Scaffold this active site. Structure first.
Site, PDB file in Angstrom:
ATOM      1  N   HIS A  44      86.547  54.007  59.825  1.00 34.26           N
ATOM      2  CA  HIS A  44      86.008  54.888  58.651  1.00 34.26           C
ATOM      3  C   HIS A  44      86.580  56.426  58.715  1.00 34.26           C
ATOM      4  CE1 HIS A  44      82.490  55.911  61.023  1.00 34.26           C
ATOM      5  NE2 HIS A  44      82.838  57.024  60.719  1.00 34.26           N
ATOM      6  N   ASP A  93      84.315  48.112  61.988  1.00 35.34           N
ATOM      7  CA  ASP A  93      84.505  49.559  61.983  1.00 35.34           C
ATOM      8  C   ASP A  93      85.219  50.084  63.338  1.00 35.34           C
ATOM      9  OD1 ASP A  93      84.701  52.053  61.126  1.00 35.34           O
ATOM     10  OD2 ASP A  93      82.530  52.500  61.570  1.00 35.34           O
ATOM     11  N   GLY A 186      79.519  63.805  62.331  1.00 34.87           N
ATOM     12  CA  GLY A 186      80.616  64.309  63.247  1.00 34.87           C
ATOM     13  C   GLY A 186      80.660  63.602  64.304  1.00 34.87           C
ATOM     14  N   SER A 188      80.664  60.155  64.592  1.00 33.57           N
ATOM     15  CA  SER A 188      81.348  58.777  64.568  1.00 33.57           C
ATOM     16  C   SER A 188      82.596  58.654  65.130  1.00 33.57           C
ATOM     17  CB  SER A 188      81.388  58.401  63.106  1.00 33.57           C
ATOM     18  OG  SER A 188      82.069  59.430  62.395  1.00 33.57           O
ATOM     19  N   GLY A 189      83.068  57.311  65.521  1.00 31.53           N
ATOM     20  CA  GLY A 189      84.152  57.327  66.458  1.00 31.53           C
ATOM     21  C   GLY A 189      84.189  57.546  67.717  1.00 31.53           C
TER      22      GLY A 189
HETATM   23  O1  LIG Z   1      80.255  63.389  57.850  1.00 27.23           O
HETATM   24  C1  LIG Z   1      81.249  63.291  58.723  1.00 27.23           C
HETATM   25  N1  LIG Z   1      81.248  62.271  59.522  1.00 27.23           N
HETATM   26  C2  LIG Z   1      80.404  60.924  59.261  1.00 27.23           C
HETATM   27  C3  LIG Z   1      81.654  59.809  59.102  1.00 27.23           C
HETATM   28  C4  LIG Z   1      82.742  60.394  58.277  1.00 27.23           C
HETATM   29  C5  LIG Z   1      83.892  60.606  59.095  1.00 27.23           C
HETATM   30  C6  LIG Z   1      85.115  61.261  58.531  1.00 27.23           C
HETATM   31  C7  LIG Z   1      85.234  61.406  57.076  1.00 27.23           C
HETATM   32  C8  LIG Z   1      83.896  61.232  56.237  1.00 27.23           C
HETATM   33  C9  LIG Z   1      82.822  60.817  57.062  1.00 27.23           C
HETATM   34  C10 LIG Z   1      79.748  60.288  60.417  1.00 27.23           C
HETATM   35  O2  LIG Z   1      79.886  61.138  61.694  1.00 27.23           O
HETATM   36  N2  LIG Z   1      79.264  59.254  60.323  1.00 27.23           N
HETATM   37  C11 LIG Z   1      78.224  58.683  61.214  1.00 27.23           C
HETATM   38  C12 LIG Z   1      76.809  58.839  61.029  1.00 27.23           C
HETATM   39  C13 LIG Z   1      76.354  59.638  59.783  1.00 27.23           C
HETATM   40  C14 LIG Z   1      75.111  59.588  59.412  1.00 27.23           C
HETATM   41  O3  LIG Z   1      74.799  60.211  58.527  1.00 27.23           O
HETATM   42  N3  LIG Z   1      73.957  59.183  60.385  1.00 27.23           N
HETATM   43  C15 LIG Z   1      74.368  58.649  61.396  1.00 27.23           C
HETATM   44  C16 LIG Z   1      73.378  57.891  62.179  1.00 27.23           C
HETATM   45  C17 LIG Z   1      73.619  57.056  63.183  1.00 27.23           C
HETATM   46  C18 LIG Z   1      74.975  56.926  63.417  1.00 27.23           C
HETATM   47 CL1  LIG Z   1      75.290  55.772  64.745  1.00 27.23          CL
HETATM   48  C19 LIG Z   1      76.087  57.569  62.703  1.00 27.23           C
HETATM   49  C20 LIG Z   1      75.673  58.203  61.661  1.00 27.23           C
HETATM   50  C21 LIG Z   1      81.729  64.758  59.250  1.00 27.23           C
HETATM   51  C22 LIG Z   1      82.853  64.636  60.160  1.00 27.23           C
HETATM   52  C23 LIG Z   1      83.589  65.711  60.501  1.00 27.23           C
HETATM   53  C24 LIG Z   1      83.233  66.728  59.969  1.00 27.23           C
HETATM   54  N4  LIG Z   1      84.056  68.135  60.111  1.00 27.23           N
HETATM   55  C25 LIG Z   1      83.357  69.169  59.623  1.00 27.23           C
HETATM   56  O4  LIG Z   1      84.151  70.227  60.041  1.00 27.23           O
HETATM   57  C26 LIG Z   1      82.236  69.509  58.710  1.00 27.23           C
HETATM   58  C27 LIG Z   1      81.834  68.259  58.289  1.00 27.23           C
HETATM   59  O5  LIG Z   1      80.716  68.484  57.627  1.00 27.23           O
HETATM   60  C28 LIG Z   1      82.181  67.207  58.973  1.00 27.23           C
HETATM   61  C29 LIG Z   1      81.491  66.015  58.741  1.00 27.23           C
END
Ligand SMILES: O=C(N[C@@H](Cc1ccccc1)C(=O)NCc1cc(=O)[nH]c2ccc(Cl)cc12)c1ccc2[nH]c(=O)cc(O)c2c1
Ligand SMILES: [Cl-]
Length: 238
Positions: A44, A93, A186, A188-189
């Site tokens: 993702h 994923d 931030g 994830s991955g």
């Molecule tokens: O939303 C982000 N990442 C999402 C996924 C994503 C990645 C790339 C593009 C769009 C969305 C995430 O981490 N998703 C994982 C995640 C999100 C969440 O809300 N709650 C969680 C609870 C538990 C677990 Cl295990 C995971 C999560 C993300 C990634 C990089 C960023 N860089 C910036 O400079 C500023 C940001 O605001 C920013 C936000």
């Protein structure tokens, strides 16, 4: 990472920060070094990434302040996403990044071992999630790599906590009943790393959850042991 603390430099030397250069340069996702030319991350993370040419992988990073225009990085030659992946919440994923140059291993950057299929019975009691993500649902990317200790939960338990989702055996969950510590945006991955018998394994990949750190909402991770054949198959030559 919610409810965690700053890491020590090099305690998580498999942890990379994957950046995009578009429109300007920022952190996109976490990832794990698993081979000299290979990062493992979440599928993702590449939503709307049209080309691997806007990607930069940084290794041996504790703080994002270390990344400047003169800082060295690994270019990405190829993004490989699982062909059954549709979206994070319905599983698969998992993605591989084939780097343009190889990593020179050192105390600052080397790989984490993939789980053994024989490890499926091991009860892990020393699992950590790491990242530069948010410290709470509305927040921002942190400078210093955070870490949090979080117990795995069983798939039956996790299923109870996401009754509107299908929590499969290719997913693994982790969290506290009362919430408090979790991955967040931030992160994830990145890796869910579990130490067993002095050896770290890459047990999961940070995938998704509802909110961050909420009570009765465990984080959901890609269950890495389920993809060791896929990883072998995809990381061969030609
Ligand atoms: O939303 C982000 N990442 C999402 C996924 C994503 C990645 C790339 C593009 C769009 C969305 C995430 O981490 N998703 C994982 C995640 C999100 C969440 O809300 N709650 C969680 C609870 C538990 C677990 Cl295990 C995971 C999560 C993300 C990634 C990089 C960023 N860089 C910036 O400079 C500023 C940001 O605001 C920013 C936000
Ligand atoms: Cl749900």
């Amino acid at each position: 990472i919610v409810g965690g603390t700053a890491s020590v430099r090099g305690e998580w030397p498999w942890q990379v920060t994957l950046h995009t250069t578009s429109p300007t340069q920022r952190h996109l996702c976490g990832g794990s070094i698993i081979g000299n030319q290979w990062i493992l991350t979440a599928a993702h993370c590449f939503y709307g990434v049209e080309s691997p040419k806007i990607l930069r992988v940084y290794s041996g990073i504790l703080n994002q302040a270390e990344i400047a225009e003169d800082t060295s990085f690994f270019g990405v030659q190829e993004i490989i996403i699982h062909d059954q992946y549709k979206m994070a919440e319905s599983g698969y994923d998992i993605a591989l990044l084939k780097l343009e140059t190889t990593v020179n291993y050192a105390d600052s950057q080397r790989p984490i071992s993939l789980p053994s299929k024989g490890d499926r019975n091991v009860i892990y009691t020393d699992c950590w999630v790491t990242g530069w993500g948010y410290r709470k649902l509305r927040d921002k990317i942190q400078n210093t790599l955070q870490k949090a200790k979080i117990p795995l939960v069983t798939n039956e338990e996790c299923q109870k906590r996401y009754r509107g989702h299908k929590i499969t055996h290719k997913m693994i969950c982790a969290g506290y009943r009362e919430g408090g510590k979790d991955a967040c945006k931030g992160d994830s991955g990145g890796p869910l790393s579990c130490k067993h018998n002095e050896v770290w394994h890459l047990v999961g990949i940070t995938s998704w959850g509802e909110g961050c750190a909420q009570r009765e909402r465990p984080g959901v991770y890609t269950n890495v042991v389920e993809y060791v054949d896929w990883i072998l198959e995809k990381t061969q030559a030609v």
